[PDB]
Design a protein around this nucleic acid. Structure first.
Lengths: 50, 50, 154, 98
DNA sequence: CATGGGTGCGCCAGACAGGG
DNA sequence: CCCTGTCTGGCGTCCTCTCACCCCATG
């Protein structure tokens, strides 16, 4: 969901270092907010601590 | 996580958090246009019990 | 004189609760003890006898009244009943997206693919309710049309 | 749905660059109107060349700017970012009006 | 398709009334 | 206030191996 129980910006990206869909599909800019959708850019276990 | 079929077998805490957020959104709506005392007393009481 | 009261129903079956309530009134013919029924809460113009109280709680899919106590339940402590109707009607008629992107004013985008970007409104269209602002994409300000609510005033 | 009006000075460049601006769209949006050329603005400056007398030796100059339109069909969010954010070819103006 | 709301256990123990 | 009865809570062995089945309902 955009801003629901399982958000993107509030917690983190489901996929490791993938922002959301069309943004950052390599290892260069880890952190930029995907222009298409608000989301963090981190690993896969980052949501477990947040 | 889903099961073999594909329907998501959801945890119990998601039911609890989703209830609290549904009631909290209703109570905030009962603060903007809002409604009389008996209504917001039942609304806050349902949030307390949630 | 008939005063108002609040009834709680199973939320979702509310029209059927209202119909069954009118039908229980015209069954047990206490027609002089009920005025209207307004629509998860059902508003009832009523008087308070224990017979009519048992009548409304014997209507199916009704939990009970909502008041200070269950002996003598409570009429209407109007705190924002009028405010509910007023704001609902106002929003339903139209919203209030104040033209954020004004001709010659920097703005902020938080919607679509241009989300999280700022720009300036070179042209504005109050009649079409659209602001002409360009967002520096790869440096190139990409003149795009965004709604007042789609962008924020900077 | 979205007018894509792009300007550049070189014709072999603006027309090369319009091939990939629909190849980055028909790959995802899969519907574009078509490459529409537009009549070019030729601005002339004919002016003297000597630092004094002989106002009969002039050199005719002309700067040609071209315009192209493709006017993409589908406003799906995927296609929007694949054009708005993905602008290529430095020295080529591109301006969009949704 | 969204969302919305039984009646077979037994001991210990301490807190809350309830006399006393 | 000093003892007596009630009312609710807290708790009760460890590893394994299959099986079956997980929210209607509907204008």
């Amino acid at each position: 969901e955009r801003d629901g129980l399982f958000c993107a910006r509030i917690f983190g990206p489901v996929k490791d270092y993938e922002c959301l869909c069309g943004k950052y599909k390599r290892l260069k800019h880890r952190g930029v907010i995907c222009e298409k959708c608000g989301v963090e850019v981190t690993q896969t276990k980052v949501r477990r601590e947040r | 996580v889903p099961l073999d079929g594909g329907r998501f077998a959801t945890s119990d805490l998601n039911d609890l958090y989703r209830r609290v957020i549904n009631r909290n959104n209703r109570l905030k709506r009962l603060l903007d246009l809002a409604a009389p005392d008996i209504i917001v007393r039942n609304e806050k009481r349902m949030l307390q019990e949630a | 004189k008939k005063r108002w009261y609040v009834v709680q129903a199973f939320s979702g079956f509310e029209g059927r609760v209202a119909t069954s309530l009118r039908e229980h009134i015209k069954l047990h013919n206490m027609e002089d003890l009920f005025g209207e029924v307004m629509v998860g809460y059902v508003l009832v113009q009523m008087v308070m006898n224990d017979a009519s109280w048992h009548l409304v709680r014997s209507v199916p899919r009704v939990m009970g009244f909502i008041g200070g106590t269950s002996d003598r339940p409570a009429p209407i402590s109007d705190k924002e009943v009028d405010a509910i109707m007023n704001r609902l009607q106002q929003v339903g008629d139209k919203p209030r997206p104040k033209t954020l992107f004004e001709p010659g004013e920097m703005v902020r985008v938080n919607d679509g693919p241009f989300a999280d970007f700022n720009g300036v409104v070179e042209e504005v269209d109050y009649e079409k309710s659209r602001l002409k602002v360009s967002v520096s994409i790869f440096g190139r300000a990409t003149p795009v049309e965004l709604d007042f609510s789609q962008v924020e005033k900077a | 749905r979205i007018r894509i009006r792009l300007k550049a000075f070189d014709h072999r460049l603006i027309d090369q660059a319009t091939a990939e601006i629909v190849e980055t769209a028909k790959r995802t949006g899969a519907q574009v109107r078509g490459p529409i050329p537009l009549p070019t603005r030729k601005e002339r400056f004919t002016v003297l060349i000597s630092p004094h007398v002989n106002k009969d030796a002039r050199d005719q100059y002309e700067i040609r700017t071209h315009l192209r339109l493709v006017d993409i069909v589908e406003p799906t969010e995927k296609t929007v970012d694949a054009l708005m954010r993905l602008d290529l070819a430095a020295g080529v103006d591109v301006q969009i009006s949704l």
